[PDB]
Amino acid sequence: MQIFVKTLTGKTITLEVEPSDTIENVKAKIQDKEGIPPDQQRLIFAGKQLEDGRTLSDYNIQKESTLHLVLRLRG
Amino acid sequence: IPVDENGHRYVGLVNQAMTSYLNSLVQSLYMTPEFRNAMYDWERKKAEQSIPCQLQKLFLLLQTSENDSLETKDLTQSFGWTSHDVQELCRLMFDALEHKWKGTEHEKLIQDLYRGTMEDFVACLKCGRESVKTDYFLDLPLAVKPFGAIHAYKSVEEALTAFVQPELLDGSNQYMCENCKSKQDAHKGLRITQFPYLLTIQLKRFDFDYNTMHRIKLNDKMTFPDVLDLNDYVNVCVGQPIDHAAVDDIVKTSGDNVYELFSVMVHSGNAAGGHYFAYIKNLDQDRWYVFNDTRVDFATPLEIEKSFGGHSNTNAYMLMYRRIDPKRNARFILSNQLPQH
Ligand SMILES: [Zn+2]
């Protein structure tokens, strides 16, 4: 229900989500919490990157889990 | 004159369109002894599209071809591309190797080489109860500018200590303690229980701006040594010259987790889009070289240190280390013993 996200600065924030919620909704809540576009977000959990369209249950993300947020570099 | 350990002339990679990061990632992986040797151990319509097969072919040509440069077009065609970062690239290659290696002895090879182990703890302060769950990590993203901090972290070790530092959850982000039956103040933190064999560490030099909504690069100074001691994490200094086995033993005695830098992924140019190249070190030769697209040359310790920061504003954004174990550390396979022709 409530999972943690270590943002770019390193300060960890909290999010309220359902296990049925898609990862796109999670990245949307990161936008509301950080003002970062979802197209630039890349979430990493247990070393595995989370892909769009798959829910949090697909990755077995349980309550109190910690996701890692990193920016997509280009060039 | 650049020469490999088997007396082969170093070979670069053609910079087709803007894919310098691909060249830097391939030259880093191809430089990894355990990863390269793993590749050689691996064995109507024909499926050229196999990313493992094309990556194996590119490694073979990178080692036994007397050519000026090599084209990565075949590898891009294996991805399924017609005209996008380096980390996402590394995930596509590794997951394609993990999928092809299911059932093979190398099924858990990417895990044993690149996966680390840590634990996340959340301690409610009213109840005084701590909840710890095991979590793993492939790369290690470290922050440079914890904004607003007037002074950015001057060294990688200082960024590591801040990464494993217990942080306090504020009122807007209070922890839902089940025993407390309410939102509560709590200590959030992460602590490393084990380091991976191949330590992949990433520097967060690319930050986002709120007002302009345009990404920017943080060229702040951050130092990293060639030898890395990380025994304090499991419970001016210069290292760019050639290593020493005696200094390794004196730190070996007081700690068993010491790592050796062998690849330095750097980025130069505009923040939104620039050029990527890497200072790569041959672990068997003990020599620093520079890999920049088609041009491969020797590397002096001066230009490697000059990229830490300080103002074409070129700075390293990713570093690759390997654990120093006399028995586990492997060498590149000589060309002769390959059973693949
Ligand atoms: Zn409590």
Residue numbers in the entry:
A (entry chain C): 1 to 75
B (entry chain D): 78 to 120, 132 to 171, 178 to 329, 381 to 456, 463 to 492
What does the paper say about this structure?
The crystal structures of the catalytic domain, in its free and ubiquitin-bound states, reveal that the misaligned catalytic triads, ultimately, become aligned upon ubiquitin-binding, similar to USP7, thereby becoming ready for catalysis. Our study provides molecular details of USP47 regulation, substrate recognition, and the hotspots for drug discovery by targeting USP47.
While the cUSP47CDC97A did not show measurable binding, cUSP47CDC97S showed a 1:1 molar binding with KD = 1.1 μM ± 0.1 μM, and this mutant led us to a non-covalently Ub-bound structure. For crystallization, we incubated cUSP47CDC97S with Ub before crystallization instead of using Ub-aldehyde or Ub-PA, which results in a covalent adduct to the catalytic Cys. The crystals diffracted to 3.0 Å resolution, and the structure was solved using the free cUSP47CDC97S described above. The β-sheet of Ub was packed against the Fingers and Palm regions in cUSP47CD, making extensive interactions. On the other hand, the C-terminus of Ub was bound in the narrow cleft between the Palm and the Thumb, leading to the catalytic site. However, in the Ub-bound structure, the N-terminal region of α1 became helical, putting the Oγ of Ser97 (equivalent to Sγ of the catalytic Cys97) 3.6 Å away from His420 Nδ1, thereby all three catalytic residues in their canonical positions. The α5, α6, and Zn shifted by approximately 4–4.5 Å in the Ub-bound structure.
